[PDB]
Enzyme design. Structure first.
Site, PDB file in Angstrom:
ATOM      1  CD1 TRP A 261      -2.302  -2.081   0.527  1.00 44.61           C
ATOM      2  CD2 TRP A 261      -3.554  -0.265   0.899  1.00 44.61           C
ATOM      3  NE1 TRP A 261      -3.614  -2.431   0.317  1.00 44.61           N
ATOM      4  CE2 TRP A 261      -4.404  -1.335   0.545  1.00 44.61           C
ATOM      5  CE3 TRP A 261      -4.120   0.982   1.184  1.00 44.61           C
ATOM      6  CZ2 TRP A 261      -5.794  -1.193   0.471  1.00 44.61           C
ATOM      7  CZ3 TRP A 261      -5.498   1.118   1.103  1.00 44.61           C
ATOM      8  CH2 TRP A 261      -6.318   0.038   0.754  1.00 44.61           C
ATOM      9  CB  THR A 389     -14.069   4.256  10.158  1.00 42.20           C
ATOM     10  OG1 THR A 389     -15.104   4.106   9.184  1.00 42.20           O
ATOM     11  CG2 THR A 389     -14.654   4.905  11.428  1.00 42.20           C
ATOM     12  CB  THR A 391      -7.347   4.677   8.008  1.00 48.88           C
ATOM     13  OG1 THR A 391      -6.973   4.032   6.786  1.00 48.88           O
ATOM     14  CG2 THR A 391      -7.975   3.664   8.944  1.00 48.88           C
TER      15      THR A 391
HETATM   16  C1  LIG Z   1      -8.798  -0.921   8.645  1.00 48.13           C
HETATM   17  C2  LIG Z   1      -7.501  -1.319   7.960  1.00 48.13           C
HETATM   18  C3  LIG Z   1      -7.229  -2.805   7.772  1.00 48.13           C
HETATM   19  C4  LIG Z   1      -6.626  -0.364   7.519  1.00 48.13           C
HETATM   20  C5  LIG Z   1      -5.301  -0.741   6.839  1.00 48.13           C
HETATM   21  C6  LIG Z   1      -5.412  -1.044   5.334  1.00 48.13           C
HETATM   22  C7  LIG Z   1      -6.370  -0.070   4.603  1.00 48.13           C
HETATM   23  C8  LIG Z   1      -5.955   1.370   4.421  1.00 48.13           C
HETATM   24  C9  LIG Z   1      -7.575  -0.546   4.132  1.00 48.13           C
HETATM   25  C10 LIG Z   1      -8.611   0.344   3.379  1.00 48.13           C
HETATM   26  C11 LIG Z   1      -9.451   1.087   4.388  1.00 48.13           C
HETATM   27  C12 LIG Z   1     -10.714   0.305   4.822  1.00 48.13           C
HETATM   28  C13 LIG Z   1     -12.004   0.455   4.001  1.00 48.13           C
HETATM   29  C14 LIG Z   1     -10.689  -0.483   5.925  1.00 48.13           C
HETATM   30  C15 LIG Z   1     -11.950  -1.262   6.372  1.00 48.13           C
HETATM   31  O1  LIG Z   1     -11.812  -1.709   7.734  1.00 48.13           O
HETATM   32  P1  LIG Z   1     -13.108  -2.380   8.445  1.00 48.13           P
HETATM   33  O2  LIG Z   1     -13.355  -3.742   7.864  1.00 48.13           O
HETATM   34  O3  LIG Z   1     -14.355  -1.544   8.185  1.00 48.13           O
HETATM   35  O4  LIG Z   1     -12.851  -2.519   9.939  1.00 48.13           O
END
Ligand SMILES: CC(C)=CCC/C(C)=C/CC/C(C)=C/COP(=O)(O)O
Ligand SMILES: [Mg+2]
Ligand SMILES: [Mg+2]
Ligand SMILES: [Mg+2]
Length: 536
Positions: A261, A389, A391
Protein backbone atom coordinates in the site's frame (compact mmCIF):
# COMPACT_ATOMS: atom_id res chain seq x y z
CA UNK A 1 -14.99 -12.18 29.21
CA UNK A 2 -15.26 -14.57 26.26
CA UNK A 3 -13.48 -12.96 23.30
CA UNK A 4 -14.35 -13.80 19.67
CA UNK A 5 -12.40 -16.57 17.94
CA UNK A 6 -9.30 -15.77 15.84
CA UNK A 7 -10.44 -15.91 12.23
CA UNK A 8 -7.72 -14.15 10.21
CA UNK A 9 -5.47 -16.16 7.91
CA UNK A 10 -1.75 -16.12 8.84
CA UNK A 11 0.83 -14.18 6.85
CA UNK A 12 1.49 -16.17 3.70
CA UNK A 13 5.02 -14.76 3.33
CA UNK A 14 6.82 -16.24 6.33
CA UNK A 15 10.28 -14.74 6.74
CA UNK A 16 11.20 -14.53 3.05
CA UNK A 17 11.41 -10.72 3.23
CA UNK A 18 13.12 -10.35 6.63
CA UNK A 19 16.66 -10.23 5.33
CA UNK A 20 17.72 -8.72 2.05
CA UNK A 21 21.41 -8.22 1.29
CA UNK A 22 21.91 -5.85 -1.66
CA UNK A 23 24.68 -6.73 -4.13
CA UNK A 24 26.60 -3.44 -4.32
CA UNK A 25 28.43 -4.52 -7.48
CA UNK A 26 25.20 -5.10 -9.39
CA UNK A 27 23.58 -1.97 -7.92
CA UNK A 28 26.53 0.23 -8.85
CA UNK A 29 26.76 -1.32 -12.31
CA UNK A 30 23.05 -0.67 -12.89
CA UNK A 31 23.25 2.91 -11.61
CA UNK A 32 26.21 3.71 -13.86
CA UNK A 33 24.49 2.36 -16.96
CA UNK A 34 21.21 4.09 -16.11
CA UNK A 35 23.03 7.42 -15.90
CA UNK A 36 24.13 6.98 -19.53
CA UNK A 37 20.74 5.68 -20.68
CA UNK A 38 19.07 8.57 -18.82
CA UNK A 39 21.08 11.12 -20.84
CA UNK A 40 20.35 9.36 -24.16
CA UNK A 41 16.67 9.40 -23.24
CA UNK A 42 16.78 13.08 -22.29
CA UNK A 43 18.19 13.87 -25.73
CA UNK A 44 15.39 11.86 -27.35
CA UNK A 45 12.86 14.09 -25.50
CA UNK A 46 14.66 17.31 -26.39
CA UNK A 47 14.96 16.43 -30.08
CA UNK A 48 13.82 19.28 -32.35
CA UNK A 49 11.47 18.87 -35.30
CA UNK A 50 9.32 16.02 -33.93
CA UNK A 51 5.71 15.63 -35.07
CA UNK A 52 2.99 15.99 -32.46
CA UNK A 53 2.03 12.31 -32.63
CA UNK A 54 5.61 11.08 -32.18
CA UNK A 55 6.22 13.49 -29.28
CA UNK A 56 3.09 12.32 -27.45
CA UNK A 57 3.84 8.63 -28.06
CA UNK A 58 7.38 9.08 -26.72
CA UNK A 59 6.11 10.79 -23.55
CA UNK A 60 3.38 8.18 -23.14
CA UNK A 61 5.92 5.35 -23.55
CA UNK A 62 8.40 6.83 -21.09
CA UNK A 63 5.52 7.27 -18.59
CA UNK A 64 4.22 3.72 -18.99
CA UNK A 65 7.80 2.35 -18.75
CA UNK A 66 7.85 3.97 -15.31
CA UNK A 67 10.89 6.18 -15.92
CA UNK A 68 9.16 9.52 -16.42
CA UNK A 69 10.03 10.56 -12.83
CA UNK A 70 13.55 11.27 -14.20
CA UNK A 71 12.14 13.76 -16.71
CA UNK A 72 9.48 15.80 -14.90
CA UNK A 73 10.88 19.12 -16.13
CA UNK A 74 11.36 18.09 -19.79
CA UNK A 75 7.96 16.43 -19.99
CA UNK A 76 6.27 19.40 -18.33
CA UNK A 77 7.88 21.89 -20.73
CA UNK A 78 6.88 19.86 -23.77
CA UNK A 79 3.25 19.35 -22.66
CA UNK A 80 3.03 23.03 -21.69
CA UNK A 81 4.07 23.95 -25.23
CA UNK A 82 1.51 21.57 -26.70
CA UNK A 83 -1.19 22.94 -24.40
CA UNK A 84 -0.53 26.51 -25.42
CA UNK A 85 -0.25 25.97 -29.18
CA UNK A 86 -3.72 24.40 -29.07
CA UNK A 87 -3.09 22.14 -32.07
CA UNK A 88 -6.48 20.72 -33.06
CA UNK A 89 -6.12 18.95 -36.40
CA UNK A 90 -5.41 15.26 -35.75
CA UNK A 91 -6.85 11.75 -35.85
CA UNK A 92 -8.60 10.08 -32.92
CA UNK A 93 -5.58 8.32 -31.39
CA UNK A 94 -3.35 11.42 -31.26
CA UNK A 95 -6.31 13.55 -30.07
CA UNK A 96 -7.35 11.21 -27.27
CA UNK A 97 -3.72 10.79 -26.14
CA UNK A 98 -3.13 14.55 -26.26
CA UNK A 99 -6.22 15.06 -24.11
CA UNK A 100 -5.30 12.41 -21.55
CA UNK A 101 -1.64 13.39 -21.08
CA UNK A 102 -2.46 17.09 -20.76
CA UNK A 103 -5.28 16.49 -18.27
CA UNK A 104 -3.21 14.02 -16.22
CA UNK A 105 -0.61 16.77 -15.90
CA UNK A 106 -3.17 19.40 -14.91
CA UNK A 107 -3.45 21.25 -18.23
CA UNK A 108 -7.14 22.05 -18.69
CA UNK A 109 -7.36 21.25 -22.41
CA UNK A 110 -10.90 21.72 -23.75
CA UNK A 111 -12.89 18.54 -24.44
CA UNK A 112 -14.14 20.14 -27.70
CA UNK A 113 -11.14 18.46 -29.31
CA UNK A 114 -13.51 15.45 -29.55
CA UNK A 115 -16.36 17.21 -31.42
CA UNK A 116 -14.98 16.41 -34.89
CA UNK A 117 -15.27 12.70 -33.91
CA UNK A 118 -18.98 12.97 -33.05
CA UNK A 119 -22.21 13.53 -34.99
CA UNK A 120 -24.89 16.22 -34.48
CA UNK A 121 -26.24 14.22 -31.53
CA UNK A 122 -22.97 14.32 -29.58
CA UNK A 123 -22.46 10.59 -30.12
CA UNK A 124 -19.15 9.23 -31.41
CA UNK A 125 -19.19 8.36 -35.09
CA UNK A 126 -19.64 4.64 -35.40
CA UNK A 127 -17.35 4.80 -38.47
CA UNK A 128 -14.47 5.04 -35.95
CA UNK A 129 -15.26 1.54 -34.72
CA UNK A 130 -12.49 0.01 -36.91
CA UNK A 131 -9.67 2.25 -35.63
CA UNK A 132 -8.39 0.14 -32.74
CA UNK A 133 -5.58 2.46 -31.64
CA UNK A 134 -8.02 5.40 -31.65
CA UNK A 135 -10.49 3.37 -29.59
CA UNK A 136 -7.82 2.33 -27.13
CA UNK A 137 -6.62 5.88 -26.49
CA UNK A 138 -10.20 7.14 -26.33
CA UNK A 139 -10.89 4.42 -23.76
CA UNK A 140 -7.97 5.48 -21.58
CA UNK A 141 -8.92 9.14 -22.00
CA UNK A 142 -12.53 8.48 -20.90
CA UNK A 143 -11.30 7.87 -17.33
CA UNK A 144 -9.87 11.37 -16.83
CA UNK A 145 -13.08 13.35 -17.19
CA UNK A 146 -14.28 16.08 -14.86
CA UNK A 147 -17.82 17.35 -14.45
CA UNK A 148 -17.23 19.79 -17.32
CA UNK A 149 -16.62 16.96 -19.82
CA UNK A 150 -20.11 15.57 -20.52
CA UNK A 151 -19.13 15.60 -24.22
CA UNK A 152 -17.21 12.43 -23.30
CA UNK A 153 -20.24 10.84 -21.60
CA UNK A 154 -20.49 8.13 -24.30
CA UNK A 155 -16.73 7.51 -24.78
CA UNK A 156 -16.33 4.69 -22.24
CA UNK A 157 -19.32 2.69 -23.53
CA UNK A 158 -18.44 3.31 -27.20
CA UNK A 159 -14.76 2.39 -27.04
CA UNK A 160 -15.41 -0.54 -24.69
CA UNK A 161 -17.90 -2.33 -26.90
CA UNK A 162 -15.78 -2.02 -30.01
CA UNK A 163 -12.48 -2.93 -28.30
CA UNK A 164 -14.16 -6.09 -26.93
CA UNK A 165 -15.29 -6.87 -30.46
CA UNK A 166 -11.88 -6.32 -32.05
CA UNK A 167 -9.69 -7.89 -29.34
CA UNK A 168 -9.72 -11.61 -30.27
CA UNK A 169 -8.30 -10.92 -33.75
CA UNK A 170 -5.61 -8.40 -32.83
CA UNK A 171 -1.87 -9.18 -33.18
CA UNK A 172 0.31 -9.47 -30.08
CA UNK A 173 1.15 -7.67 -27.91
CA UNK A 174 -1.62 -5.20 -28.90
CA UNK A 175 -4.24 -7.83 -28.08
CA UNK A 176 -2.86 -8.29 -24.56
CA UNK A 177 -2.65 -4.51 -24.08
CA UNK A 178 -6.31 -4.06 -25.15
CA UNK A 179 -7.50 -7.01 -23.05
CA UNK A 180 -5.54 -5.69 -20.05
CA UNK A 181 -6.86 -2.11 -20.48
CA UNK A 182 -10.46 -3.39 -20.40
CA UNK A 183 -9.79 -4.96 -16.95
CA UNK A 184 -7.63 -2.14 -15.60
CA UNK A 185 -7.47 1.32 -17.15
CA UNK A 186 -4.15 3.14 -16.88
CA UNK A 187 -5.36 6.28 -15.05
CA UNK A 188 -6.82 4.32 -12.11
CA UNK A 189 -4.12 1.64 -11.80
CA UNK A 190 -1.26 1.55 -9.30
CA UNK A 191 1.73 3.04 -11.22
CA UNK A 192 4.33 0.33 -10.30
CA UNK A 193 1.77 -2.39 -11.07
CA UNK A 194 0.97 -0.97 -14.49
CA UNK A 195 4.63 -0.26 -15.17
CA UNK A 196 5.59 -3.89 -14.40
CA UNK A 197 2.89 -5.18 -16.76
CA UNK A 198 3.78 -2.76 -19.57
CA UNK A 199 7.53 -3.42 -19.46
CA UNK A 200 7.30 -7.23 -19.37
CA UNK A 201 4.08 -8.14 -21.17
CA UNK A 202 3.87 -5.36 -23.75
CA UNK A 203 6.92 -3.23 -24.55
CA UNK A 204 9.31 -6.18 -24.34
CA UNK A 205 7.26 -7.88 -27.07
CA UNK A 206 6.69 -4.91 -29.40
CA UNK A 207 8.29 -5.23 -32.84
CA UNK A 208 8.90 -1.46 -32.91
CA UNK A 209 10.25 -1.16 -29.34
CA UNK A 210 13.12 1.25 -28.70
CA UNK A 211 15.95 -0.82 -27.25
CA UNK A 212 17.44 2.06 -25.30
CA UNK A 213 14.10 2.74 -23.55
CA UNK A 214 13.42 -0.95 -22.85
CA UNK A 215 16.86 -1.51 -21.29
CA UNK A 216 16.56 1.72 -19.29
CA UNK A 217 13.10 0.67 -18.05
CA UNK A 218 14.20 -2.81 -16.91
CA UNK A 219 17.39 -1.70 -15.14
CA UNK A 220 15.63 1.16 -13.39
CA UNK A 221 12.73 -1.03 -12.27
CA UNK A 222 15.09 -3.71 -10.94
CA UNK A 223 17.33 -1.13 -9.25
CA UNK A 224 14.40 0.52 -7.47
CA UNK A 225 13.13 -2.95 -6.56
CA UNK A 226 16.40 -3.49 -4.60
CA UNK A 227 15.62 -0.37 -2.58
CA UNK A 228 12.05 -1.55 -1.99
CA UNK A 229 13.29 -4.90 -0.75
CA UNK A 230 15.71 -3.18 1.67
CA UNK A 231 12.89 -1.03 3.00
CA UNK A 232 10.61 -4.05 3.35
CA UNK A 233 13.35 -5.93 5.22
CA UNK A 234 13.91 -2.98 7.54
CA UNK A 235 10.16 -2.82 8.17
CA UNK A 236 9.83 -6.60 8.54
CA UNK A 237 12.55 -6.38 11.24
CA UNK A 238 10.71 -3.58 12.99
CA UNK A 239 7.46 -5.58 12.98
CA UNK A 240 9.21 -8.70 14.23
CA UNK A 241 10.76 -6.83 17.18
CA UNK A 242 7.30 -5.65 18.23
CA UNK A 243 6.01 -9.25 18.20
CA UNK A 244 2.26 -8.56 18.05
CA UNK A 245 2.02 -11.86 16.18
CA UNK A 246 2.21 -13.57 19.60
CA UNK A 247 1.19 -10.90 22.17
CA UNK A 248 -1.78 -9.61 20.15
CA UNK A 249 -2.77 -12.83 18.33
CA UNK A 250 -6.27 -11.58 17.48
CA UNK A 251 -4.76 -9.15 14.99
CA UNK A 252 -4.04 -9.50 11.27
CA UNK A 253 -0.40 -10.08 10.36
CA UNK A 254 -0.16 -7.99 7.17
CA UNK A 255 3.00 -5.90 7.14
CA UNK A 256 3.87 -6.99 3.58
CA UNK A 257 0.43 -5.93 2.29
CA UNK A 258 0.84 -2.68 4.24
CA UNK A 259 4.17 -2.14 2.47
CA UNK A 260 2.52 -2.71 -0.91
CA UNK A 261 0.00 0.00 0.00
CA UNK A 262 2.78 2.45 0.92
CA UNK A 263 4.56 1.53 -2.33
CA UNK A 264 1.42 2.44 -4.27
CA UNK A 265 1.37 5.91 -2.70
CA UNK A 266 4.92 6.56 -3.96
CA UNK A 267 7.65 4.33 -5.38
CA UNK A 268 10.43 6.86 -6.07
CA UNK A 269 13.77 6.72 -4.22
CA UNK A 270 13.40 10.24 -2.74
CA UNK A 271 10.31 9.01 -0.84
CA UNK A 272 12.11 6.16 0.94
CA UNK A 273 11.78 7.71 4.42
CA UNK A 274 8.15 8.65 3.72
CA UNK A 275 7.28 5.08 2.65
CA UNK A 276 8.78 3.51 5.76
CA UNK A 277 6.95 5.99 8.04
CA UNK A 278 3.71 5.38 6.17
CA UNK A 279 3.81 1.58 6.32
CA UNK A 280 4.46 1.67 10.09
CA UNK A 281 1.30 3.77 10.49
CA UNK A 282 -0.83 1.51 8.28
CA UNK A 283 0.42 -1.50 10.28
CA UNK A 284 -0.33 0.11 13.61
CA UNK A 285 -3.80 1.49 12.77
CA UNK A 286 -4.63 -1.98 11.43
CA UNK A 287 -3.91 -3.35 14.94
CA UNK A 288 -6.14 -0.71 16.49
CA UNK A 289 -8.87 -1.54 13.99
CA UNK A 290 -8.73 -5.23 14.91
CA UNK A 291 -8.86 -4.25 18.59
CA UNK A 292 -12.18 -2.44 17.98
CA UNK A 293 -13.49 -5.02 15.50
CA UNK A 294 -12.48 -8.40 16.80
CA UNK A 295 -11.41 -8.40 20.44
CA UNK A 296 -12.20 -5.51 22.75
CA UNK A 297 -15.32 -5.18 24.88
CA UNK A 298 -17.38 -1.97 24.92
CA UNK A 299 -15.96 -0.99 28.32
CA UNK A 300 -12.36 -1.64 27.16
CA UNK A 301 -12.86 0.30 23.94
CA UNK A 302 -14.16 3.30 25.91
CA UNK A 303 -11.00 3.43 28.03
CA UNK A 304 -8.84 2.86 24.94
CA UNK A 305 -10.60 5.70 23.09
CA UNK A 306 -10.25 8.15 25.96
CA UNK A 307 -6.61 7.19 26.51
CA UNK A 308 -5.91 8.00 22.84
CA UNK A 309 -7.57 11.43 23.13
CA UNK A 310 -5.35 12.34 26.12
CA UNK A 311 -2.20 10.85 24.50
CA UNK A 312 0.00 10.48 27.56
CA UNK A 313 2.02 7.54 28.81
CA UNK A 314 0.41 8.17 32.26
CA UNK A 315 -2.79 6.67 30.89
CA UNK A 316 -1.56 3.09 30.31
CA UNK A 317 -2.64 1.98 33.79
CA UNK A 318 -6.32 2.59 33.03
CA UNK A 319 -6.02 -0.01 30.27
CA UNK A 320 -6.09 -3.84 30.24
CA UNK A 321 -2.66 -5.45 29.84
CA UNK A 322 -3.18 -6.34 26.20
CA UNK A 323 -4.20 -2.75 25.33
CA UNK A 324 -1.13 -1.41 27.17
CA UNK A 325 0.87 -3.14 24.45
CA UNK A 326 -0.59 -1.36 21.43
CA UNK A 327 -0.95 1.98 23.25
CA UNK A 328 2.71 2.22 24.27
CA UNK A 329 3.71 1.04 20.79
CA UNK A 330 1.58 3.81 19.25
CA UNK A 331 3.01 6.50 21.51
CA UNK A 332 6.57 5.31 20.90
CA UNK A 333 6.07 5.22 17.11
CA UNK A 334 5.19 8.91 17.10
CA UNK A 335 8.14 9.67 19.36
CA UNK A 336 10.31 7.86 16.76
CA UNK A 337 8.80 9.99 13.97
CA UNK A 338 9.65 13.17 15.88
CA UNK A 339 13.24 12.00 16.41
CA UNK A 340 13.64 10.93 12.80
CA UNK A 341 12.35 14.32 11.59
CA UNK A 342 14.48 16.27 14.05
CA UNK A 343 17.60 16.99 11.99
CA UNK A 344 15.43 18.44 9.22
CA UNK A 345 13.72 20.71 11.75
CA UNK A 346 10.39 19.11 10.83
CA UNK A 347 9.45 17.38 14.14
CA UNK A 348 6.56 19.78 14.84
CA UNK A 349 4.45 18.45 11.95
CA UNK A 350 3.92 15.04 13.55
CA UNK A 351 1.00 16.50 15.57
CA UNK A 352 -1.07 16.74 12.35
CA UNK A 353 -1.05 12.95 11.93
CA UNK A 354 -1.61 12.48 15.67
CA UNK A 355 -4.79 14.59 15.53
CA UNK A 356 -6.06 12.56 12.56
CA UNK A 357 -5.39 9.30 14.39
CA UNK A 358 -7.40 10.55 17.38
CA UNK A 359 -10.25 11.26 14.95
CA UNK A 360 -10.08 7.73 13.51
CA UNK A 361 -10.24 6.23 17.00
CA UNK A 362 -13.17 8.43 18.10
CA UNK A 363 -15.09 7.22 15.07
CA UNK A 364 -14.06 3.59 15.63
CA UNK A 365 -15.73 3.86 19.04
CA UNK A 366 -18.88 5.40 17.56
CA UNK A 367 -19.01 2.52 15.05
CA UNK A 368 -18.74 0.05 17.94
CA UNK A 369 -21.54 1.83 19.81
CA UNK A 370 -23.76 1.63 16.72
CA UNK A 371 -23.14 -2.11 16.34
CA UNK A 372 -23.92 -2.86 19.99
CA UNK A 373 -27.14 -0.75 19.93
CA UNK A 374 -28.23 -2.24 16.60
CA UNK A 375 -28.47 1.26 15.17
CA UNK A 376 -28.95 1.96 11.47
CA UNK A 377 -28.22 5.67 10.83
CA UNK A 378 -29.35 7.59 7.72
CA UNK A 379 -26.68 7.85 5.00
CA UNK A 380 -25.67 11.41 5.88
CA UNK A 381 -25.10 10.44 9.52
CA UNK A 382 -23.43 7.16 8.46
CA UNK A 383 -20.98 9.07 6.27
CA UNK A 384 -20.25 11.74 8.88
CA UNK A 385 -18.71 8.90 10.94
CA UNK A 386 -17.63 6.25 8.47
CA UNK A 387 -15.59 8.44 6.12
CA UNK A 388 -12.82 8.83 8.73
CA UNK A 389 -12.89 5.10 9.58
CA UNK A 390 -11.49 4.44 6.08
CA UNK A 391 -8.34 5.87 7.72
CA UNK A 392 -7.80 7.79 4.47
CA UNK A 393 -7.69 11.33 5.99
CA UNK A 394 -5.14 9.88 8.40
CA UNK A 395 -3.06 8.05 5.75
CA UNK A 396 -2.96 11.07 3.44
CA UNK A 397 -1.75 13.16 6.37
CA UNK A 398 0.75 10.49 7.27
CA UNK A 399 2.05 10.35 3.70
CA UNK A 400 3.30 13.93 4.04
CA UNK A 401 5.42 13.28 7.17
CA UNK A 402 8.44 11.93 5.34
CA UNK A 403 8.13 14.26 2.36
CA UNK A 404 10.99 16.70 2.84
CA UNK A 405 9.31 19.55 0.98
CA UNK A 406 5.95 19.35 2.82
CA UNK A 407 5.40 22.54 4.80
CA UNK A 408 3.03 23.70 7.54
CA UNK A 409 0.87 25.38 4.90
CA UNK A 410 0.52 22.04 3.08
CA UNK A 411 -0.70 20.36 6.30
CA UNK A 412 -3.04 23.31 6.93
CA UNK A 413 -4.65 22.90 3.51
CA UNK A 414 -5.07 19.17 4.12
CA UNK A 415 -6.58 19.70 7.58
CA UNK A 416 -9.53 21.53 5.98
CA UNK A 417 -10.67 18.35 4.20
CA UNK A 418 -10.16 19.67 0.67
CA UNK A 419 -12.37 18.34 -2.10
CA UNK A 420 -9.74 16.10 -3.70
CA UNK A 421 -9.02 14.45 -0.34
CA UNK A 422 -12.74 14.04 0.38
CA UNK A 423 -13.25 12.38 -3.01
CA UNK A 424 -10.43 9.92 -2.37
CA UNK A 425 -11.94 9.09 1.03
CA UNK A 426 -15.40 8.65 -0.54
CA UNK A 427 -14.02 6.28 -3.15
CA UNK A 428 -12.45 4.11 -0.44
CA UNK A 429 -15.67 4.17 1.62
CA UNK A 430 -18.20 3.22 -1.06
CA UNK A 431 -16.01 0.65 -2.80
CA UNK A 432 -15.22 -1.14 0.44
CA UNK A 433 -18.91 -0.95 1.47
CA UNK A 434 -19.96 -2.50 -1.85
CA UNK A 435 -17.38 -5.26 -1.53
CA UNK A 436 -17.71 -6.03 2.19
CA UNK A 437 -21.48 -5.62 2.54
CA UNK A 438 -22.34 -9.34 2.53
CA UNK A 439 -19.72 -10.34 5.11
CA UNK A 440 -20.54 -7.49 7.50
CA UNK A 441 -24.27 -8.25 7.12
CA UNK A 442 -23.52 -11.84 8.20
CA UNK A 443 -21.69 -10.60 11.28
CA UNK A 444 -24.73 -8.55 12.33
CA UNK A 445 -23.22 -5.19 11.38
CA UNK A 446 -26.50 -3.44 10.57
CA UNK A 447 -24.83 -0.02 10.37
CA UNK A 448 -22.84 -0.96 7.26
CA UNK A 449 -23.02 1.53 4.39
CA UNK A 450 -25.22 -0.32 1.90
CA UNK A 451 -27.68 -1.22 4.69
CA UNK A 452 -27.93 2.42 5.76
CA UNK A 453 -28.53 3.26 2.10
CA UNK A 454 -31.25 0.64 1.63
CA UNK A 455 -33.09 1.70 4.79
CA UNK A 456 -32.72 5.45 4.21
CA UNK A 457 -33.94 5.61 0.57
CA UNK A 458 -36.22 2.55 0.76
CA UNK A 459 -34.41 0.78 -2.11
CA UNK A 460 -32.99 -2.71 -2.80
CA UNK A 461 -29.41 -3.89 -2.25
CA UNK A 462 -28.84 -3.63 -6.01
CA UNK A 463 -30.14 -0.06 -6.24
CA UNK A 464 -28.10 0.92 -3.19
CA UNK A 465 -24.94 -0.48 -4.75
CA UNK A 466 -25.73 1.41 -7.96
CA UNK A 467 -26.07 4.61 -5.92
CA UNK A 468 -22.73 4.00 -4.21
CA UNK A 469 -21.17 3.35 -7.61
CA UNK A 470 -22.42 6.78 -8.76
CA UNK A 471 -20.84 8.33 -5.70
CA UNK A 472 -17.50 6.79 -6.70
CA UNK A 473 -17.82 8.10 -10.29
CA UNK A 474 -18.65 11.59 -9.04
CA UNK A 475 -15.67 11.41 -6.69
CA UNK A 476 -13.32 10.43 -9.54
CA UNK A 477 -14.50 13.47 -11.52
CA UNK A 478 -13.68 15.60 -8.44
CA UNK A 479 -10.24 14.03 -8.13
CA UNK A 480 -9.57 14.71 -11.83
CA UNK A 481 -10.75 18.31 -11.50
CA UNK A 482 -8.67 18.67 -8.32
CA UNK A 483 -5.53 18.05 -10.37
CA UNK A 484 -6.15 20.94 -12.80
CA UNK A 485 -3.91 24.03 -12.73
CA UNK A 486 -3.71 26.22 -10.75
CA UNK A 487 -3.47 23.65 -7.93
CA UNK A 488 -4.02 24.82 -4.34
CA UNK A 489 -0.80 23.09 -3.30
CA UNK A 490 2.11 21.63 -5.27
CA UNK A 491 1.12 18.62 -7.43
CA UNK A 492 3.66 16.66 -5.41
CA UNK A 493 1.09 16.72 -2.58
CA UNK A 494 -1.92 15.81 -4.73
CA UNK A 495 -0.44 12.63 -6.26
CA UNK A 496 -0.39 10.70 -2.94
CA UNK A 497 -4.11 11.39 -2.65
CA UNK A 498 -4.75 10.25 -6.20
CA UNK A 499 -2.63 7.15 -5.53
CA UNK A 500 -4.64 6.33 -2.41
CA UNK A 501 -7.76 6.24 -4.64
CA UNK A 502 -5.95 4.06 -7.18
CA UNK A 503 -4.91 1.60 -4.45
CA UNK A 504 -8.61 1.23 -3.52
CA UNK A 505 -9.63 0.42 -7.08
CA UNK A 506 -6.78 -2.04 -7.50
CA UNK A 507 -7.28 -3.81 -4.13
CA UNK A 508 -11.03 -4.24 -4.55
CA UNK A 509 -10.94 -4.95 -8.31
CA UNK A 510 -13.95 -6.94 -9.59
CA UNK A 511 -15.49 -6.27 -6.15
CA UNK A 512 -13.85 -8.57 -3.58
CA UNK A 513 -11.83 -7.55 -0.50
CA UNK A 514 -8.08 -7.68 -1.06
CA UNK A 515 -6.28 -6.63 2.12
CA UNK A 516 -8.03 -8.98 4.57
CA UNK A 517 -7.89 -11.61 1.78
CA UNK A 518 -4.53 -10.88 0.14
CA UNK A 519 -4.47 -14.28 -1.57
CA UNK A 520 -6.81 -13.26 -4.39
CA UNK A 521 -5.76 -9.76 -5.41
CA UNK A 522 -2.55 -8.57 -3.74
CA UNK A 523 -0.38 -11.71 -3.78
CA UNK A 524 0.41 -11.60 -7.53
CA UNK A 525 1.23 -7.86 -7.32
CA UNK A 526 3.51 -8.35 -4.35
CA UNK A 527 5.32 -11.14 -6.21
CA UNK A 528 5.72 -9.00 -9.34
CA UNK A 529 6.87 -5.91 -7.45
CA UNK A 530 8.88 -7.26 -4.52
CA UNK A 531 9.92 -10.84 -5.33
CA UNK A 532 10.61 -11.44 -9.06
CA UNK A 533 12.91 -9.11 -10.96
CA UNK A 534 12.17 -8.30 -14.61
CA UNK A 535 14.27 -10.63 -16.75
CA UNK A 536 16.73 -8.87 -19.03
C1 LIG B 1 -8.80 -0.92 8.65
C2 LIG B 1 -7.50 -1.32 7.96
C3 LIG B 1 -7.23 -2.81 7.77
C4 LIG B 1 -6.63 -0.36 7.52
C5 LIG B 1 -5.30 -0.74 6.84
C6 LIG B 1 -5.41 -1.04 5.33
C7 LIG B 1 -6.37 -0.07 4.60
C8 LIG B 1 -5.95 1.37 4.42
C9 LIG B 1 -7.58 -0.55 4.13
C10 LIG B 1 -8.61 0.34 3.38
C11 LIG B 1 -9.45 1.09 4.39
C12 LIG B 1 -10.71 0.30 4.82
C13 LIG B 1 -12.00 0.45 4.00
C14 LIG B 1 -10.69 -0.48 5.92
C15 LIG B 1 -11.95 -1.26 6.37
O1 LIG B 1 -11.81 -1.71 7.73
P1 LIG B 1 -13.11 -2.38 8.45
O2 LIG B 1 -13.35 -3.74 7.86
O3 LIG B 1 -14.35 -1.54 8.18
O4 LIG B 1 -12.85 -2.52 9.94
MG1 LIG C 1 -11.77 -4.19 10.63
MG1 LIG D 1 -13.09 -1.50 11.75
MG1 LIG E 1 -16.26 -2.77 5.15
Amino acid sequence: IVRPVADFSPSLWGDQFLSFSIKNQVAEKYAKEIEALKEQTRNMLLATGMKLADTLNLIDTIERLGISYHFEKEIDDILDQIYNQNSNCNDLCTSALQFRLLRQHGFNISPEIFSKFQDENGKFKESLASDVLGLLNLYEASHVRTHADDILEDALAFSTIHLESAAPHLKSPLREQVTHALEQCLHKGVPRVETRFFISSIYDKEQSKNNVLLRFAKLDFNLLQMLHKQELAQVSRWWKDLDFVTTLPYARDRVVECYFWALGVYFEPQYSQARVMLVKTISMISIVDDTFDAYGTVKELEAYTDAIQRWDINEIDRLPDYMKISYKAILDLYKDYEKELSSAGRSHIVCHAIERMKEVVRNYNVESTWFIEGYTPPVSEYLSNALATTTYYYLATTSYLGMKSATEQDFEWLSKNPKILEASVIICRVIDDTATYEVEKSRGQIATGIECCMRDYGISTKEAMAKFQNMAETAWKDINEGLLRPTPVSTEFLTPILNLARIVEVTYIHNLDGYTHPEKVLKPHIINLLVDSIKI
